[PDB]
Design a protein around this nucleic acid. Structure first.
Lengths: 274, 43, 89
RNA sequence: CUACCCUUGGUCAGGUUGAAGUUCAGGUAACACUGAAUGGAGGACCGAACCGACUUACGUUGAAAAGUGAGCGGAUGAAC
RNA sequence: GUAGCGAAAGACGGGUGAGAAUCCCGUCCACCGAUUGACUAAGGUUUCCAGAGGAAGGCUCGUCCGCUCUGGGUUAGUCGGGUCCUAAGCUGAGGCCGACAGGCGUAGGCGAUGGAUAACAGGUUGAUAUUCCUGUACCACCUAUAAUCGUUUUAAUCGAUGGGGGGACGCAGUAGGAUAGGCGAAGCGUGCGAUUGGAUUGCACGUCUAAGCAGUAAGGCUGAGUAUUAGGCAAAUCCGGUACUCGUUAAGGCUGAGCUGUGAUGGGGAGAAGACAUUGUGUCUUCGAGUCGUUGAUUUCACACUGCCGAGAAAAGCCUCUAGAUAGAAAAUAGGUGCCCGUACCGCAAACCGACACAGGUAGUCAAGAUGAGAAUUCUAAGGUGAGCGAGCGAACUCUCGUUAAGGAACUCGGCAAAAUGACCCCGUAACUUCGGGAGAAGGGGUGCUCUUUAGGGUUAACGCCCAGAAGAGCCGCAGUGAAUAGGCCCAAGCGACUGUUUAUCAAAAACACAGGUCUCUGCUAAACCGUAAGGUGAUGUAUAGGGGCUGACGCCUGCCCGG
C-alpha cells in the first residue's frame, strides 16, 4: 500500500512512500551485478548536454533478461527484489539446471510459480511468447520491436498494451499512451501487466529527497538575463512577451510538433496520440 | 585568506613539463619558440 | 668494472668512529647497487663482507663571489666487515 | 583561485524532544478508549569542533589589495 | 629628526666581552594549556649540527643563525613508495570520421585518493634511527639434506588459457563483551618538616614488546550424510534445483573471534648512591628495591545484531574442484641470499601560500587533574614560551575597559550600542492549530554550611563510601549555580509556506530553489542537446518514462472573449 507520514517536521507534512510489501528479499544476486558510474548529463566531450542530472545515491546495475531467450525450460520464481534503476521491481528466476536470471516482475506473480518461454508456452502471467501465438484481447508487456532484440515497449511500472487484431505479418497493438501500432508478429511479449502499480502516488515531500535521486534544481527562464534565455530580462516580473513560449535554445515550446517527416515507421502507425 | 597558487609537484609536472608539451603540436611549438629565443629552461 | 666503482674513502670523525667497529665508508659511483659494492670490496681488499648500507646525498648549493652553483651528488656506501681489516690511513 | 560534476576517502563534544510501532492496565468492559512501560524517527530543537557572514565597534599612506573584537546563522544533512 | 617600529610580563644576580634592556647560566615570577603542546601529510629544499670573523642581512648587537670553512650530517628483506591490482579519467594497432592540422573509438595499456603484503624490546650521537648496535623474531628465494606419494594416467604434487566461491563494501540505533587509560586504599618503599599546632605523616610507588604454547568472552550457520544432471565454450572428484536420515539440538559439528595465563624475561629497567681511589664524584666495572589489592571504564569484537530507503565499486592476492601434464614430490633441517627510491630540518609555521621573521590560510592522528552533561567554563600537569630588537619617563584627545546620585528611551531615522535574561531542580502554562505543535509560552518558587535520620541512588556489605531519600533541627553573611560560562519576553500586522541558495570584495532579501499543480512535446537509432562529421548524453531508460514552459506547501477556489 502506501504509508502516510505523521507531520512531525515541516518537511514531512505531506509525504508518502511505498511500504515495499511486495519485496520479499532485500539483497541482490551477486553474479548479476555490474557497476554503473554516474555521467551526470555530460557526453564524451565532457560537456553538459542535458540539464538537471546530478548526483544521487550510488547504485549498481542489475542485468535484466529483456529478450526471453531460454526456451522450453521452465523456471521457478525465487524472489521479488527492489531495483534502483527502474520503477518496476524485479524477479529472480532460476531455471531447471541452475541458471539464474532477473526479469521484470509482473503484477500478480508469486514466489514459487513457474515461468517459461516459447511458442509452446501457454497464456498465463509472466510467460513470454511470439505475438503470433498470443490471442487477441489480452494485455501484454515487455514487447519487442525487432525479433530477438529484446523487449522495449511497456516496461515501466504499471504498464501494458493489448493485442487488437492481426494483419498479414503484423499485429495491431494499442500502446499505453493511447496510440495503436503495428508490430512484427515474430516479436515476443510477456503476458500481463508490469507490477508495482502505486509508484505514481508517492509524494516526494521534501526538496532533498529529490536530490537523493540525482535531480539538480531547475531555474525558470523568465528570471534569467537576456543573454541566457529568450524569456529573460524585464524590469519587474514580466509576461512572456513573445508570440510563443521558447526553449532556452530558442525554439517554440508549447505545441509545435517535433517528430520528423519521412520516418520509415510512419506507415506502421495507424492512429497516434501524444 | 586562501590564495591563488597552491603548489603541487605532480600537477606541475603534469600540465607543464616536457612530455606534456611534446604530446601536442602546439606544445611542440612552445618548445621551439623557447629554443629559438635561447631560454635556459624549456619547461 | 670493480675498481671504477669504488672511488674514494671518506675520512671524518663519524667515519673514524665507525672504523672503531668494522665499518668502512666509501664514495662510490652513483649508478651502482650494493651487491656490486660488496663484490668490489671483496675483490679488491680481499676480505669478507657482512653487510653494506647506502645512501644518496643531494647536490649542495654553493657560492664563490657572484658565481653560484652546485656540488656533485654523492653515493655513500658503508660496508661492515665480517672478518679481515683494511689498512687505509 | 573559483562554478558545476566524476571516482575514491574522511569528520561531526554534549544535551533535549520522543514518530511509526509494540506491549500491560487505571475508566475499564464485548480492551476500549487512554494511562504506564518499551522503542528510537526527524532536510527536529538548544549548543562546542567545523562551516558561514546578519549587526556593531575598530582598522582605512591598515598587522591584512577584505582582517580583528564582541555578539550572530547552520551544526545527521539539498552538511562539511 | 616627523609617522611608524606588527597583539602578549618580566625582575635581579652571575658570566663573557673592545663594548650588554639585547647573548649565556641561575633563581623567582608569569603566559598557553582540545593548546602558542606532541606526531603524520602536502609544500619548501640544506634552513639541520659544530667551530670561527660576520664589511652587508635582522624595524639592535654578535658578544646567533637562515654570510665562510668544512667538521660535516640522512644507513631499512619487515616503515612509506616501485619490481602487484584495478576506479574516474587519459591514451589506444587494426577501425570510423574529417580542407589540412586533426577528432572519435576496439581489444589492450597507463592510472590511488581504494584493495593486497613480513618487527618488536632495549642501548647509543653534536647531528639519523622500527634503518646503526644487542637480543628475540617473522617473510621470501636458492642450493645441499633425509623417511615418505610412487601405471605417473591417476596419485596429497603438478594444473589451466577452466570453473565455482571469496575478496566485496549504505545509514541510523542498541545491547553486551573485553581492553587502554584514569582511581581509592598500609602490600611496599622516603622522609619527619621550623612561623602555631598535628605526627595514621607528608607522600609516592607497584613495571616490560612483537613473535609462539595453551584456551576464549561472544558472533554467523535450511546446522552433518545418499542418487541424478537442459549447464559452468570441453575435465572436474567443485559450483545450483529437487527426492531423503538425526532435522528447527548447537550440543559443540564447522568457519571465523576480541582477549587472558605460561614461558619471551631469573633479561631489560626499576621509586634506588647502598659502589669509588674516578669518567669535573655529576658519572658508574661489582653488588639488590616491591611485582599487592580495589573501584569504575574510551578504542576493538563487528555495520555483529536490529531497523530503514535513497538500495549502498572493481580487479588481483586468496580458497576450492579438475582436465591435462609429468618422476615427484615436501618437508623439516643446515646453509646461503634479500635489489631500487625516500629518510637531515621546518611543518596548523621565522623554513609552506600570502612582496615581509605579515594578528590571515593550511588535510589527518594523540590529548592528563579539578569542575561539570560536556572536548563548555575557570584554574592547572606534562610540554612549550616570555614575542622575537625597540626601550625608559608621565596633559588635551582618540580607542578598549569598569563605576555612577535622581530620573528611565525624554536619545535617535530607528532602543543602534549597552544593560537586563541565562545553569540545575520543583510548580504552573493562553489564543490558535495542518493535532505535530505553539512551549523553555507567559508566570512562580528553590539552591551555602553543620548536626541528627527514618532512608534512599544505594558505595549497599549498611547506616559507614560519595551524592543524598529528602525530612527535621541549627549556624553565618549585604548577597549561597556567592567566580566564569549558560534564552530577554509579550501583543499586533506585511511578505515568503517550510530546511536550503545568492551578488569572492558596499545588497542575504519579499529575489532563486523546493515539495506539489498544470500545459505541451516525444513509440525508441525517441524528442531534446553537444559536434562539421563520426561519436555521444538522454539511458545500459521505454509514456506510472524522458525533455521543455509557466506556477509554487496546504485549504477554498480559478469567471468572460478564439475577432487579432
Amino acid at each position: 500500500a502506501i504509508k502516510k507520514y505523521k507531520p512531525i517536521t515541516n518537511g514531512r507534512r505531506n509525504m508518502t512512500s511505498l511500504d515495499f510489501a511486495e519485496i520479499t528479499k532485500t539483497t541482490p544476486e551477486k553474479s548479476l551485478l555490474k557497476p554503473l558510474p554516474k555521467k551526470a548529463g555530460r557526453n564524451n566531450q565532457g560537456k553538459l548536454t542535458v540539464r538537471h542530472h546530478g548526483g544521487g545515491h550510488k547504485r549498481q546495475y542489475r542485468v535484466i533478461d529483456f529478450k526471453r531467450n531460454k526456451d522450453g525450460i521452465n523456471a521457478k520464481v525465487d524472489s521479488i527484489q527492489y531495483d534502483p534503476n527502474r520503477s518496476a521491481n524485479i524477479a529472480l528466476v532460476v531455471y531447471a539446471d541452475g541458471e539464474k536470471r532477473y526479469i521484470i516482475a509482473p503484477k500478480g506473480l508469486e514466489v514459487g510459480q513457474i515461468v517459461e518461454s516459447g511458442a509452446e508456452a501457454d497464456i498465463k502471467v509472466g510467460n513470454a511468447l511470439p505475438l503470433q501465438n498470443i490471442p487477441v484481447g489480452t494485455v501484454v508487456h515487455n514487447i519487442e520491436l525487432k525479433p530477438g532484440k529484446g523487449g522495449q515497449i511497456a516496461r515501466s511500472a504499471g504498464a501494458s498494451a493489448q493485442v487488437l487484431g492481426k494483419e498479414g505479418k503484423y499485429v495491431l497493438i494499442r500502446l499505453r499512451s493511447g496510440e495503436v501500432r503495428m508490430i512484427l508478429s515474430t516479436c515476443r511479449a510477456t503476458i500481463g501487466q508490469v507490477g508495482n502499480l502505486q509508484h505514481e502516488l508517492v509524494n516526494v515531500g521534501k526538496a532533498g529527497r529529490s536530490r537523493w535521486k540525482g535531480i539538480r534544481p531547475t531555474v525558470r527562464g523568465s528570471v534569467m538575463n537576456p543573454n541566457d534565455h529568450p524569456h529573460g530580462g524585464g524590469e519587474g516580473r514580466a509576461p512572456i512577451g513573445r508570440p510563443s513560449p521558447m526553449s532556452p535554445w530558442g525554439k517554440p515550446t508549447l505545441g509545435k510538433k517535433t517528430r520528423r517527416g519521412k520516418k520509415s515507421s510512419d506507415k506502421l502507425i495507424v492512429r497516434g496520440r501524444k | 585568506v586562501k590564495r591563488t597558487y597552491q603548489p603541487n609537484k605532480r600537477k606541475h609536472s603534469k600540465v607543464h613539463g616536457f612530455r606534456k608539451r611534446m604530446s601536442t603540436k602546439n606544445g611542440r611549438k612552445v618548445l621551439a619558440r623557447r629554443r629559438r629565443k635561447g631560454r635556459k629552461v624549456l619547461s | 668494472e670493480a675498481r671504477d666503482i669504488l672511488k674514494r674513502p671518506v675520512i671524518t670523525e663519524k667515519s673514524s668512529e665507525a672504523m672503531a667497529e668494522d665499518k668502512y665508508t666509501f664514495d662510490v659511483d652513483t649508478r651502482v647497487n650494493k651487491t656490486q659494492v660488496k663484490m668490489a670490496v671483496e675483490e679488491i681488499f680481499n676480505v669478507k663482507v657482512a653487510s653494506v648500507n647506502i645512501m644518496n646525498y643531494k647536490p649542495k648549493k654553493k657560492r664563490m663571489g657572484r658565481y653560484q652553483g652546485y656540488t656533485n651528488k654523492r653515493r655513500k656506501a658503508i660496508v661492515t666487515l665480517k672478518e679481515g681489516s683494511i689498512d687505509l690511513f
